[PDB]
């Protein structure tokens, strides 16, 4: 509808995931606020966009369609007023900064070196489905209580419900152009149903330091619990994006440090230099990089297009964190870049409640790593291919040391 971003009809999705960073930077240029067809939404692409919708009182939070499909009501991530103020507290304790410094080294610090201890002296490695995920998966599974789910099978949970969270092109009519790919989703919900179920008849009964727990029994008059069918959607949010996010962010650090082998060796010879350079990783490539939307609640003009209410509007973090207005050739990685703020978080009421962990996560496993291996580098016979447009990452590390 929009006539000079004819062009736009013509964007497929399998360009979006493959590499969605060249339409965006047309879109940070022609329109900040564009309605993207394949997507079947408006689509916010800069910084300053982005931020004001996120922050905006003219908006609320708001599921993308397939998010929505996949993972039903009420997602933390797409609930509002009294039922996102009860969610934001039953998760936000165990992620509290000052609980999490009382125990996050104990609990990553021996995953790191229990995968390290696999592969170090090998020589080789795969450091995607070796190191960061596995890591990552099995971090949050132990806080949450899911000790006995092994870690192959919560990287596999996390694939499908990304798959079919982001399963997001809408056809000529607007209808899902691919209605089949939320099978593989609705399959993973019941295998998680399966496993988590007797987790959950366990827990009511016999409460524990597991999270899943706390968020049965936190807040509760006496001898309540929640409802799990009102924890699942959260439990899924959990399961996709809290699973799958720290892994995604270690790795493109790692393979940003790589493209500056001056500053890979920088930070291996100063771990301190380590928060940084996972700051500008998660800018430089967002782990979640258009998975959230908000949607107006009254008549609002962003970006010179006045939207009805009820608009919904796709937050592309990662597009945003490559504006040029902010930052100088963002396409680089650069360690050495001033520490300005980043989107990668998100922002607003329903910004990041994880922070403060992840980034100890994603810490504490590059420092382990460094220290096992110091002469790591990338194994350059291999390409590293990054996929995603909802959740972005690098599919696979390829890495060589002389042992
Ligand atoms: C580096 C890994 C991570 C990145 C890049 C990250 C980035 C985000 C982003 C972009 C959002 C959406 C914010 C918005 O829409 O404005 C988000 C929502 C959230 N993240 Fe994180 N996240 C990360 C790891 C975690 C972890 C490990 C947890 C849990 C332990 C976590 C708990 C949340 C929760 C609960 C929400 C929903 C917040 C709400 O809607 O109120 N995140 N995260
Ligand atoms: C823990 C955050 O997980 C998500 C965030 C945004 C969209 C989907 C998610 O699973």
Same mark, same amino acid.
Request: charged residues 25%.
């Given at each position: ?246 892994? #995604?962010? *270690?790795?493109?650090? /790692?393979?940003? +440090? @790589?493209?500056?082998?001056?500053? !890979? =060796? ?93 980034? #100890?996560? *994603?810490?504490?496993? /590059?420092?382990? +790593? @460094?220290?096992?291996?110091?002469? !790591? =580098? ?26």
């Amino acid at each position: 509808e929009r006539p000079d971003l004819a062009w736009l009809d013509e964007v497929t999705m399998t360009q979006l995931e493959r590499n969605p960073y060249e339409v965006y930077e047309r879109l940070r240029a022609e329109a900040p606020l564009a309605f993207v067809p394949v997507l079947g939404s408006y689509v916010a692409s800069t910084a300053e966009v982005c931020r004001e919708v996120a922050t905006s009182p003219d908006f609320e939070a708001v599921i993308t369609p397939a998010g929505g499909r996949t993972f039903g009501h009420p997602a933390i991530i797409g609930v509002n007023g009294d039922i996102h103020a009860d969610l934001r507290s039953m998760v936000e304790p165990a992620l509290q900064p000052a609980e999490v410094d009382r125990w996050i080294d104990d609990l990553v610090r021996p995953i790191a070196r229990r995968y390290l201890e696999r592969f170090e002296n090998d020589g080789h490695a795969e450091l995607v489905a070796q190191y960061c995920e596995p890591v990552s998966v099995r971090s949050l599974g132990d806080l949450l209580g899911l000790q006995e789910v092994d870690s192959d099978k919560l990287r596999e949970w996390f694939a499908k419900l990304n798959r079919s969270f982001t399963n997001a092109a809408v056809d000529e009519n607007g209808e899902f152009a691919n209605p089949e790919g939320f099978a593989e989703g609705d399959q993973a919900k019941a295998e998680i149903r399966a496993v988590v179920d007797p987790l959950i008849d366990k827990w009511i009964e016999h409460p524990d330091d597991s999270a899943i727990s706390h968020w049965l029994h936190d807040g509760m008059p006496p001898g309540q619990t929640r409802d799990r069918e009102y924890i699942y959607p959260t439990i899924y949010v959990y399961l996709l994006g809290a699973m799958q996010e720290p892994g #995604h962010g *270690m790795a493109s650090t /790692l393979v940003g +440090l @790589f493209s500056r082998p001056e500053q !890979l =060796e920088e930070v291996v010879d100063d771990p301190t230099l380590i928060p940084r350079a996972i700051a500008e990783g998660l800018r430089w490539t967002s782990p979640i990089w258009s998975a959230t939307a908000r949607i107006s609640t009254k008549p609002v003009t962003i970006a010179g297009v006045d939207l009805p209410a009820g608009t919904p509007v796709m937050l592309s973090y990662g597009s945003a964190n490559h504006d040029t207005g902010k930052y100088e050739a963002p396409s680089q990685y650069d360690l050495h870049r001033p520490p300005l703020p980043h989107l990668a978080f998100g922002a607003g009421n329903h910004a990041c409640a994880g922070i403060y962990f992840a980034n #100890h996560v *994603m810490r504490i496993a /590059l420092e382990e +790593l @460094f220290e096992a291996i110091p002469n !790591l =580098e990338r194994d350059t016979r291999e390409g590293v291919e990054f996929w995603g447009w909802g959740f972005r990452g690098p599919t696979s590390l390829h890495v060589t040391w002389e042992v």
